PDB file of N, CA and C in Angstrom:
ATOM      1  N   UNK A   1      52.745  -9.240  25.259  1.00 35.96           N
ATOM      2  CA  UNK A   1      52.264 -10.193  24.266  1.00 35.96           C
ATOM      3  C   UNK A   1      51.263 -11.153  24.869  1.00 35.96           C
ATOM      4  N   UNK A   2      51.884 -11.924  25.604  1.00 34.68           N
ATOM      5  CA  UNK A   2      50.923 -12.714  26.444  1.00 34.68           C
ATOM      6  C   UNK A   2      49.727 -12.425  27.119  1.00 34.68           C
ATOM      7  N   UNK A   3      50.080 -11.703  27.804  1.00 34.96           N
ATOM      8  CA  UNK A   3      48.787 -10.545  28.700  1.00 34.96           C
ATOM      9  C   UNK A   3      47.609 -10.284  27.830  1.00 34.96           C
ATOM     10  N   UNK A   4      48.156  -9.723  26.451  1.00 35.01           N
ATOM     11  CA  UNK A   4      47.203  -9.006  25.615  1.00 35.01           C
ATOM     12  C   UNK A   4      46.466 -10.515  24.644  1.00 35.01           C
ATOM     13  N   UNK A   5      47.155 -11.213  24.460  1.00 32.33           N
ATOM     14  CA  UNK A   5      46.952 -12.141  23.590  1.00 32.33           C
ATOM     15  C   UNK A   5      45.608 -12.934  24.384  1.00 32.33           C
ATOM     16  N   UNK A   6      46.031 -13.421  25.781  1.00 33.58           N
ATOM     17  CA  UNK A   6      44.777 -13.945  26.098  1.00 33.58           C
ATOM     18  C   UNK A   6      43.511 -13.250  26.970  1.00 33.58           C
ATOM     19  N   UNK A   7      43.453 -11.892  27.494  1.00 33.51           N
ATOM     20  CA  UNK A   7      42.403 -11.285  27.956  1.00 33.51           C
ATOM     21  C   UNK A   7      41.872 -11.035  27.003  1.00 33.51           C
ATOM     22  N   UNK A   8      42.596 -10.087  25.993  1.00 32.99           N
ATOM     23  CA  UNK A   8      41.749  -9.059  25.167  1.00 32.99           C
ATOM     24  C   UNK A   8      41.105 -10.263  23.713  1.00 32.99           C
ATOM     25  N   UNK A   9      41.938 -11.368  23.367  1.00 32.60           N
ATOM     26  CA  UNK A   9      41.007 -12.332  22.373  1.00 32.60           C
ATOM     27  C   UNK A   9      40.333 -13.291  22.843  1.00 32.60           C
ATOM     28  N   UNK A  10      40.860 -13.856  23.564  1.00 33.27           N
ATOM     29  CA  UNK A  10      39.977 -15.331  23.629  1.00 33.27           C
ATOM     30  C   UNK A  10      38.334 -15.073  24.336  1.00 33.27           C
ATOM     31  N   UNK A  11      39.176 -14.267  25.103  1.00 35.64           N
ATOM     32  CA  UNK A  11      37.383 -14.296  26.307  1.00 35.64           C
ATOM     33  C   UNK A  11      36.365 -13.096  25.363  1.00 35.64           C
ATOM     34  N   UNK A  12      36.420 -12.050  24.633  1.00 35.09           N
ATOM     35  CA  UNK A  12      36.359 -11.684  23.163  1.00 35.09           C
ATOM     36  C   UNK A  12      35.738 -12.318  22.107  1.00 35.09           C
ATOM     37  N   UNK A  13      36.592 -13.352  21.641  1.00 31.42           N
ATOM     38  CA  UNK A  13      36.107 -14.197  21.008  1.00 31.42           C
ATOM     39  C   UNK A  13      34.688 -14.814  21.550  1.00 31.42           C
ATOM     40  N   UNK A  14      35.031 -15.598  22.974  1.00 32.15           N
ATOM     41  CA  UNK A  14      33.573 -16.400  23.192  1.00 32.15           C
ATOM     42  C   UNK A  14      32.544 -15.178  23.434  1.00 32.15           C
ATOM     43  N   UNK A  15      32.552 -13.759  23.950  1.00 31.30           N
ATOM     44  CA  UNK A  15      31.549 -13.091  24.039  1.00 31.30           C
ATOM     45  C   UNK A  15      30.570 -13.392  22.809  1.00 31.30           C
ATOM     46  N   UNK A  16      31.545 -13.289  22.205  1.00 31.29           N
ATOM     47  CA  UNK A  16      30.715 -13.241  20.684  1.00 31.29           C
ATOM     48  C   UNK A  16      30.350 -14.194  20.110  1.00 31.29           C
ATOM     49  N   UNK A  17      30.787 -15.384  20.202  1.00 34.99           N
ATOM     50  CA  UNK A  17      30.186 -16.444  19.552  1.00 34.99           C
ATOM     51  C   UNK A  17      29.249 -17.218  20.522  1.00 34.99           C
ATOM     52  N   UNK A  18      28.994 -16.569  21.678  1.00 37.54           N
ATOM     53  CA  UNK A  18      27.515 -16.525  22.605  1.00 37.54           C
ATOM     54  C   UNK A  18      26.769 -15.622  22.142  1.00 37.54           C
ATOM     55  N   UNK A  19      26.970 -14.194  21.914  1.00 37.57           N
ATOM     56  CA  UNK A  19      26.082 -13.170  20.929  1.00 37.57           C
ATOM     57  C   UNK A  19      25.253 -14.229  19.900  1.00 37.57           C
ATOM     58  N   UNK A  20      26.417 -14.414  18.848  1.00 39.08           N
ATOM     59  CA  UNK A  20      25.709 -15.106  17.767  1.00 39.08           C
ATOM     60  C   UNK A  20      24.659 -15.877  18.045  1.00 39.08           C
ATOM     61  N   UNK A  21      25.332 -16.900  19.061  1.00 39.00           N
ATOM     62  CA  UNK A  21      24.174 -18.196  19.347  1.00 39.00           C
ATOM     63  C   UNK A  21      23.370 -17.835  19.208  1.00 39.00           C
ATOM     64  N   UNK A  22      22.861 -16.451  20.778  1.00 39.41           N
ATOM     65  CA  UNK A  22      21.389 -16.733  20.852  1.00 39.41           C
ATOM     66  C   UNK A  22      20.809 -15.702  19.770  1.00 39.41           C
ATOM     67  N   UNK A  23      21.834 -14.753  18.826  1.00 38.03           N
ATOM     68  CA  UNK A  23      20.979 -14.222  17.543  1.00 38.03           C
ATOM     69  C   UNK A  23      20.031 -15.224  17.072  1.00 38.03           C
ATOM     70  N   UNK A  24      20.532 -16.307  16.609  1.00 37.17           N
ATOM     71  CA  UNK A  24      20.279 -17.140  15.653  1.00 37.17           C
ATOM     72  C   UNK A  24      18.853 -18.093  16.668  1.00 37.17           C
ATOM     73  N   UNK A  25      19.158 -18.485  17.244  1.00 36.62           N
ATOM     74  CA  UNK A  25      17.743 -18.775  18.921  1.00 36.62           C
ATOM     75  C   UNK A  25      17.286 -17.611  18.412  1.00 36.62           C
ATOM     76  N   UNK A  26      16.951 -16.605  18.264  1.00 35.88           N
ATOM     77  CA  UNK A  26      16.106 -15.628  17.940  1.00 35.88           C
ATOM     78  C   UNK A  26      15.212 -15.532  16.735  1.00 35.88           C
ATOM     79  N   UNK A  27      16.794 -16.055  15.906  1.00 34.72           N
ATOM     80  CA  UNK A  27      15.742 -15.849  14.455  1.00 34.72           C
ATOM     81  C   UNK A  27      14.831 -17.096  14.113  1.00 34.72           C
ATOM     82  N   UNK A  28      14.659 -17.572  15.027  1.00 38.30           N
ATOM     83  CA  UNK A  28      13.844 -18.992  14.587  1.00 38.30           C
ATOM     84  C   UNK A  28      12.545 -18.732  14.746  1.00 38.30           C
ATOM     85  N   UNK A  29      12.184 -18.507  15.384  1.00 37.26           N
ATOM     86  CA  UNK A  29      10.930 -17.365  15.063  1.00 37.26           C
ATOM     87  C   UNK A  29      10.218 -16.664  14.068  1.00 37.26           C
ATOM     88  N   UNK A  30      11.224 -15.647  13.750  1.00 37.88           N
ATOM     89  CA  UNK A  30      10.884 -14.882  12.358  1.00 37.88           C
ATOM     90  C   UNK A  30      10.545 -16.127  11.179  1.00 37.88           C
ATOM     91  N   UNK A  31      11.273 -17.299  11.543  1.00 40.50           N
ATOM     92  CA  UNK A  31      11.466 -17.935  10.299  1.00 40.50           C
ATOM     93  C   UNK A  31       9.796 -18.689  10.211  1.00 40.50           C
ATOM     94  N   UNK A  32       9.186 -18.855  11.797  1.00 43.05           N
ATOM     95  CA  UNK A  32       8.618 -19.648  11.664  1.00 43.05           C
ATOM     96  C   UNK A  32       7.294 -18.749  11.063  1.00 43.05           C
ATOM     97  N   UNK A  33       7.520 -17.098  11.871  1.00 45.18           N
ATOM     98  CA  UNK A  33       6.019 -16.217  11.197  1.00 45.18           C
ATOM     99  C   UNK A  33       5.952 -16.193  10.046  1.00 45.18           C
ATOM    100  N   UNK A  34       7.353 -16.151   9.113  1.00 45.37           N
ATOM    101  CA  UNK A  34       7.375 -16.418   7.707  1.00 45.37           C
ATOM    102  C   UNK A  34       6.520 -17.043   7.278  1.00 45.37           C
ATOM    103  N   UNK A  35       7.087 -18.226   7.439  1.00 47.23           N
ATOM    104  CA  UNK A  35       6.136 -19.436   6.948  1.00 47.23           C
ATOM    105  C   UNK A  35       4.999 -18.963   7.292  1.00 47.23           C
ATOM    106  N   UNK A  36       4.043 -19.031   8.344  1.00 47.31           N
ATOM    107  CA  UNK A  36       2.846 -18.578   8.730  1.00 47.31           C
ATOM    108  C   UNK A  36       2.277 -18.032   7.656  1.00 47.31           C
ATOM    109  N   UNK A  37       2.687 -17.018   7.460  1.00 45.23           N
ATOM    110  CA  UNK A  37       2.417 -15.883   6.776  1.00 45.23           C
ATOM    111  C   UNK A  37       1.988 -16.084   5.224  1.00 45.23           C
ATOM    112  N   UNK A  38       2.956 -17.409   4.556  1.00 47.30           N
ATOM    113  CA  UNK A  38       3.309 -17.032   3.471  1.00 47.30           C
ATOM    114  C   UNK A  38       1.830 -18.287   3.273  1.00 47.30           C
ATOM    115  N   UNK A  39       1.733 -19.254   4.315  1.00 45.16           N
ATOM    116  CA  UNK A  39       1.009 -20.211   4.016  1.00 45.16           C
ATOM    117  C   UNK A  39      -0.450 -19.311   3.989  1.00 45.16           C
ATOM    118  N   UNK A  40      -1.112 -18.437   5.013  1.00 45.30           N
ATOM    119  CA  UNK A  40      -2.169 -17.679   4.530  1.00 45.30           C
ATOM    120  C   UNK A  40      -2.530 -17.428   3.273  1.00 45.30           C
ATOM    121  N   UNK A  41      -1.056 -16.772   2.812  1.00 48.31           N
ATOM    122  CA  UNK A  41      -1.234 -16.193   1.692  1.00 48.31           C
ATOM    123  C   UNK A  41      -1.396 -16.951   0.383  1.00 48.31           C
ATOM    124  N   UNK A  42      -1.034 -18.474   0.143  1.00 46.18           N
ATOM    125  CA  UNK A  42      -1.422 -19.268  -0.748  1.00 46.18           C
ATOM    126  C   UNK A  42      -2.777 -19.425  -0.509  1.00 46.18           C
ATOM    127  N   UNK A  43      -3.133 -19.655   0.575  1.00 46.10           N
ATOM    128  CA  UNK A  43      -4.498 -20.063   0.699  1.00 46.10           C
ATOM    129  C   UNK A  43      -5.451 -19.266   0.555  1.00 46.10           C
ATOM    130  N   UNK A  44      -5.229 -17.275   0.469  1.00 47.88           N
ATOM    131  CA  UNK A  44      -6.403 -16.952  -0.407  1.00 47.88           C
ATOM    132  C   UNK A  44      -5.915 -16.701  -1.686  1.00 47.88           C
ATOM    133  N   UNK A  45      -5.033 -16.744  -2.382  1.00 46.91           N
ATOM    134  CA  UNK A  45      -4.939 -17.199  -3.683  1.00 46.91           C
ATOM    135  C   UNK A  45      -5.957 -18.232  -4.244  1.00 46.91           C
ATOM    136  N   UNK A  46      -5.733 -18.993  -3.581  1.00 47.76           N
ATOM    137  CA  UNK A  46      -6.498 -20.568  -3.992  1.00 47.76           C
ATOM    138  C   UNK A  46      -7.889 -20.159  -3.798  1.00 47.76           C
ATOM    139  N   UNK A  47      -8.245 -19.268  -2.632  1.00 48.36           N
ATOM    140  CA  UNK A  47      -9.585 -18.900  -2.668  1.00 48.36           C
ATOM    141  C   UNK A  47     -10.339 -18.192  -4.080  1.00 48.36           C
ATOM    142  N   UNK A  48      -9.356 -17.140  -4.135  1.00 44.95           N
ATOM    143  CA  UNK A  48      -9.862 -16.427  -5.224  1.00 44.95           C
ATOM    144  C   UNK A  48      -9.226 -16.910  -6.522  1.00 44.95           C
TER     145      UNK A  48
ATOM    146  N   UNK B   1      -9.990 -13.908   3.938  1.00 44.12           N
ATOM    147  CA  UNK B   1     -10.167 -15.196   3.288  1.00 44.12           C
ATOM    148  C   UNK B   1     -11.337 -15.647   4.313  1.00 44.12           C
ATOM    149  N   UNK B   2     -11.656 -15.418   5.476  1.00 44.17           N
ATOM    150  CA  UNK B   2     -12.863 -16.167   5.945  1.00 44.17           C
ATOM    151  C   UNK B   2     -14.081 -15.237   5.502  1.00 44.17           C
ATOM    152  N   UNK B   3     -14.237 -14.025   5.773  1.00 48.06           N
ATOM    153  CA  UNK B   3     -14.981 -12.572   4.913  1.00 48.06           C
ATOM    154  C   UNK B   3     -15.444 -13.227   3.893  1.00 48.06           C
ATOM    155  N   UNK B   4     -14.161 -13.223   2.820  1.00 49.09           N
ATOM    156  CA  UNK B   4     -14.471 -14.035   1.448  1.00 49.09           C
ATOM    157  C   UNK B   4     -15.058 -14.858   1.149  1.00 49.09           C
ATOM    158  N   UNK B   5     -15.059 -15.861   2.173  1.00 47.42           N
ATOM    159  CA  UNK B   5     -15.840 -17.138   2.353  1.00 47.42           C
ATOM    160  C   UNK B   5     -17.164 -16.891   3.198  1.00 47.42           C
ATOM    161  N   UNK B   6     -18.419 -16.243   2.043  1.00 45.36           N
ATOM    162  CA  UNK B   6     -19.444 -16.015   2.432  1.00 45.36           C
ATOM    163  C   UNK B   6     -19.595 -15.334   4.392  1.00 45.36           C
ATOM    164  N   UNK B   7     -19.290 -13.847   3.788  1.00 47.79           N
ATOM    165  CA  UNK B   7     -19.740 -13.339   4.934  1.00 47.79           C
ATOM    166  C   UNK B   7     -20.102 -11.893   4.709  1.00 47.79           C
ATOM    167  N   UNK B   8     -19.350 -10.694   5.875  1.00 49.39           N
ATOM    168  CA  UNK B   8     -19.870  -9.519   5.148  1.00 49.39           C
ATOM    169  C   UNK B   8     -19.443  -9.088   4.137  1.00 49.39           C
ATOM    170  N   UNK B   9     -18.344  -9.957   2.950  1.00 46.30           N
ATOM    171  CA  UNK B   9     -17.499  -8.925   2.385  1.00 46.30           C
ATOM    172  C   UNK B   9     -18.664  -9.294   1.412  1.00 46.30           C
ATOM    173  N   UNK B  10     -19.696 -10.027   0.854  1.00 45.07           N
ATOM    174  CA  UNK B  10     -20.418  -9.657  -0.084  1.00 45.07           C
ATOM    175  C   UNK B  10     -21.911  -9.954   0.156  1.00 45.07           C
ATOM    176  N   UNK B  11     -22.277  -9.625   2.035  1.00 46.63           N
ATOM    177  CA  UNK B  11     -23.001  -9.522   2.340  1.00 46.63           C
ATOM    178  C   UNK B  11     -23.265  -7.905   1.999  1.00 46.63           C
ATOM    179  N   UNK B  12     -22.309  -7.108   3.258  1.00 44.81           N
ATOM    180  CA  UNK B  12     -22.501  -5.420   3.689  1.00 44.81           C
ATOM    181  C   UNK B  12     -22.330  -5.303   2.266  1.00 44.81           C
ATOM    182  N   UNK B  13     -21.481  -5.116   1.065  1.00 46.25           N
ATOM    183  CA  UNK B  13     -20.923  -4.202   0.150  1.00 46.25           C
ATOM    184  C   UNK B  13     -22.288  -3.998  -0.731  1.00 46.25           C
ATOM    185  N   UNK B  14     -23.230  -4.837  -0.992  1.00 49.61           N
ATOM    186  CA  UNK B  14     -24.757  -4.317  -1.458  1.00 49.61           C
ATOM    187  C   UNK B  14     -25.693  -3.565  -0.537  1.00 49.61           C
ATOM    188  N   UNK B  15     -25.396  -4.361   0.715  1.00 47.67           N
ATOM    189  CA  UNK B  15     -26.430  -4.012   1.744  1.00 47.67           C
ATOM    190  C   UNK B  15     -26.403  -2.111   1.987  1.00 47.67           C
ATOM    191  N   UNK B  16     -25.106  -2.175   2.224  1.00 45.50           N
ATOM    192  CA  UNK B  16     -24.906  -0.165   2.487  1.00 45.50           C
ATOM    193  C   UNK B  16     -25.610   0.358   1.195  1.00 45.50           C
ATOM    194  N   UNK B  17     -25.380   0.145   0.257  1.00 42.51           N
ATOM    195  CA  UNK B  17     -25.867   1.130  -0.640  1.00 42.51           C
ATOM    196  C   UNK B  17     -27.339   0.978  -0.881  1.00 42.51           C
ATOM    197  N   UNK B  18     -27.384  -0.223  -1.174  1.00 44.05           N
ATOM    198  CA  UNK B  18     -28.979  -0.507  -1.228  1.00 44.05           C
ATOM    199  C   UNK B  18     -29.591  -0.126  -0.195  1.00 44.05           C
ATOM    200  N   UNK B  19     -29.924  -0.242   0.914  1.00 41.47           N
ATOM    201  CA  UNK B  19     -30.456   0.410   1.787  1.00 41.47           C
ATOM    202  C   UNK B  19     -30.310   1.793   2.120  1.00 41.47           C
ATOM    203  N   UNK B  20     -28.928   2.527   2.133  1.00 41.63           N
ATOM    204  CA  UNK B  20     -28.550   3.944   2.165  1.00 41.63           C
ATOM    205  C   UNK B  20     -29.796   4.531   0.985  1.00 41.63           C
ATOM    206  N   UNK B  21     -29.086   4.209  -0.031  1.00 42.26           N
ATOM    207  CA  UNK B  21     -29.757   4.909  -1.426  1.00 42.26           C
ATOM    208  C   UNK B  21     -31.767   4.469  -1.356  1.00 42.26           C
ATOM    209  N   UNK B  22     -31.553   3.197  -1.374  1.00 41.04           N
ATOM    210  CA  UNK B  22     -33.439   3.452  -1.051  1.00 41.04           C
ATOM    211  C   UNK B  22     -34.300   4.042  -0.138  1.00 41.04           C
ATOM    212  N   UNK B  23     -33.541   3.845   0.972  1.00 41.39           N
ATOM    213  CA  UNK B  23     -34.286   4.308   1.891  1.00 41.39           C
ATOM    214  C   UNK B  23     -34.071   5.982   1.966  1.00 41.39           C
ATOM    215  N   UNK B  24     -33.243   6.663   1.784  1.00 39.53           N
ATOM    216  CA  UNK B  24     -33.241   7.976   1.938  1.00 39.53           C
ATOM    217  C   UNK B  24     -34.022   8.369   0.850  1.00 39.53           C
ATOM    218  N   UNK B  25     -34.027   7.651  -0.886  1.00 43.75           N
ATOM    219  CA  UNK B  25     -34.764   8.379  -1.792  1.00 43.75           C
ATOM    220  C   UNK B  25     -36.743   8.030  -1.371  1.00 43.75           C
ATOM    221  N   UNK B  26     -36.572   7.218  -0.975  1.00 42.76           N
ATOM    222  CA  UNK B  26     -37.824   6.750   0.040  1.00 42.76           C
ATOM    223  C   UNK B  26     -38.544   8.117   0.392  1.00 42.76           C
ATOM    224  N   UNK B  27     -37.566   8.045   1.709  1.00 46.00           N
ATOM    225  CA  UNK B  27     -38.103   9.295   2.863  1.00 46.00           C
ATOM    226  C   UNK B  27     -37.915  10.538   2.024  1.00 46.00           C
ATOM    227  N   UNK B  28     -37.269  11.173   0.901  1.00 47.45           N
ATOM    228  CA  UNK B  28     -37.247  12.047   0.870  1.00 47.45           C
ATOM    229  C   UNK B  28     -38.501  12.045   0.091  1.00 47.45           C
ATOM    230  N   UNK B  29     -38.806  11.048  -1.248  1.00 46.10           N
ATOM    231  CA  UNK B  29     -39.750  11.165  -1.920  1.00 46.10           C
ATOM    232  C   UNK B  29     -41.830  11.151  -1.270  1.00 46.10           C
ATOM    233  N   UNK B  30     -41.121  10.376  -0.297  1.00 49.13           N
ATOM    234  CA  UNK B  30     -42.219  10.544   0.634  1.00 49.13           C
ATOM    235  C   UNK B  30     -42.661  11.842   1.395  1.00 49.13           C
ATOM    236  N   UNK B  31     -41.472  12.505   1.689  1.00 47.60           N
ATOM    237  CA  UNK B  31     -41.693  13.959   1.769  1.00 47.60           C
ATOM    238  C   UNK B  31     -42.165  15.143   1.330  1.00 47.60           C
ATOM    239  N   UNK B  32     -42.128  14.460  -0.281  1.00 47.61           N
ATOM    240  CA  UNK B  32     -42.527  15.180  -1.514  1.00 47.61           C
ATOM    241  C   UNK B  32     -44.011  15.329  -1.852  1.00 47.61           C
ATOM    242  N   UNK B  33     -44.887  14.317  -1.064  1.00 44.58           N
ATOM    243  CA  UNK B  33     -46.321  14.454  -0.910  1.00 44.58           C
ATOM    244  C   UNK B  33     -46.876  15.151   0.137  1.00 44.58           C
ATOM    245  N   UNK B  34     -45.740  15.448   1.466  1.00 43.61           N
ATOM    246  CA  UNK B  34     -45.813  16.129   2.687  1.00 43.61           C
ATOM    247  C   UNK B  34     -46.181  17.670   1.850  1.00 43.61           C
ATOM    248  N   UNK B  35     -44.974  17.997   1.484  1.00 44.50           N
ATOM    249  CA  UNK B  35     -44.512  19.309   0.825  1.00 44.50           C
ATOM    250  C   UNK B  35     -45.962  19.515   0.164  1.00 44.50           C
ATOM    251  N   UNK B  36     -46.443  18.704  -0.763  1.00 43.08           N
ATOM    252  CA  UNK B  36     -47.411  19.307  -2.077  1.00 43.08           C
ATOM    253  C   UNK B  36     -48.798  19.492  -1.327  1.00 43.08           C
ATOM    254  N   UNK B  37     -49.185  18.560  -0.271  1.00 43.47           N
ATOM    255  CA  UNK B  37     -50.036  18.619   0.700  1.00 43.47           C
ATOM    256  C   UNK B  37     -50.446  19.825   1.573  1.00 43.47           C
ATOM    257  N   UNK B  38     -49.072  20.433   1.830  1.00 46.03           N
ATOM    258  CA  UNK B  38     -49.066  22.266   2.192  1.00 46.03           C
ATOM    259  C   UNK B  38     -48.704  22.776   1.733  1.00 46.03           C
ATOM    260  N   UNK B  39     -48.668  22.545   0.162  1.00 43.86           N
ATOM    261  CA  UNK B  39     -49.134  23.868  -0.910  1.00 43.86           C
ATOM    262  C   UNK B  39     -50.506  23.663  -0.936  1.00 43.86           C
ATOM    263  N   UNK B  40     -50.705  22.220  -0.930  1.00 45.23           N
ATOM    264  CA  UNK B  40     -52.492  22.565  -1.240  1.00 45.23           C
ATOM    265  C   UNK B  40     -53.284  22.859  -0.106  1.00 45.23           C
ATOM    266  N   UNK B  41     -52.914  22.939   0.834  1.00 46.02           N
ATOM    267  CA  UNK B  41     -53.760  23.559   2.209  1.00 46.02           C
ATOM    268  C   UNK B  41     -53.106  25.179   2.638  1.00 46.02           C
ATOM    269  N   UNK B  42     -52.240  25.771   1.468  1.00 46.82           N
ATOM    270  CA  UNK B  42     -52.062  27.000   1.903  1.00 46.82           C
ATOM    271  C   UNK B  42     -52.168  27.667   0.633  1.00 46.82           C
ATOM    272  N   UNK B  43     -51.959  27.482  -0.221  1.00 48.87           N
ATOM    273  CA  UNK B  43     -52.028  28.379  -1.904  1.00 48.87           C
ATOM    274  C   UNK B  43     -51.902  26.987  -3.218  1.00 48.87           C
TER     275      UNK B  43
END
């Protein structure tokens, strides 16, 4: 019980909620080409 | 959008044809006095 309870979850657990972190450090990026992107794209609207 | 904003996109899009199309009916029509020039110096 013990044995299994704290190797196999806890240290488990934090793998992964370090995964996540730096997912999300990642997607900040995408978020920002978004924007980029989307602001071009009003602006030849407005052109034409 | 900078194209758009006065450049080749409605510079080139007359320029190719207008020049393609005149100038070849040009040279060819100009050719056309070559041609009649040696009919008349041969029959």
């Amino acid at each position: 019980m013990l044995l299994q309870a704290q190797i196999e979850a806890e240290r488990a657990r934090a793998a992964h909620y370090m995964s996540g972190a730096g997912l999300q450090d990642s997607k900040v990026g995408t978020e920002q080409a978004k924007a980029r992107a989307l602001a071009s794209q009003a602006d030849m609207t407005d052109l034409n | 959008f900078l194209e758009q904003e006065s450049g080749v996109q409605q510079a080139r899009k007359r320029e190719l044809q207008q020049a393609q199309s005149e100038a070849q009916g040009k040279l060819a029509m100009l050719n056309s006095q070559l041609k009649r020039l040696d009919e008349a110096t041969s029959a």
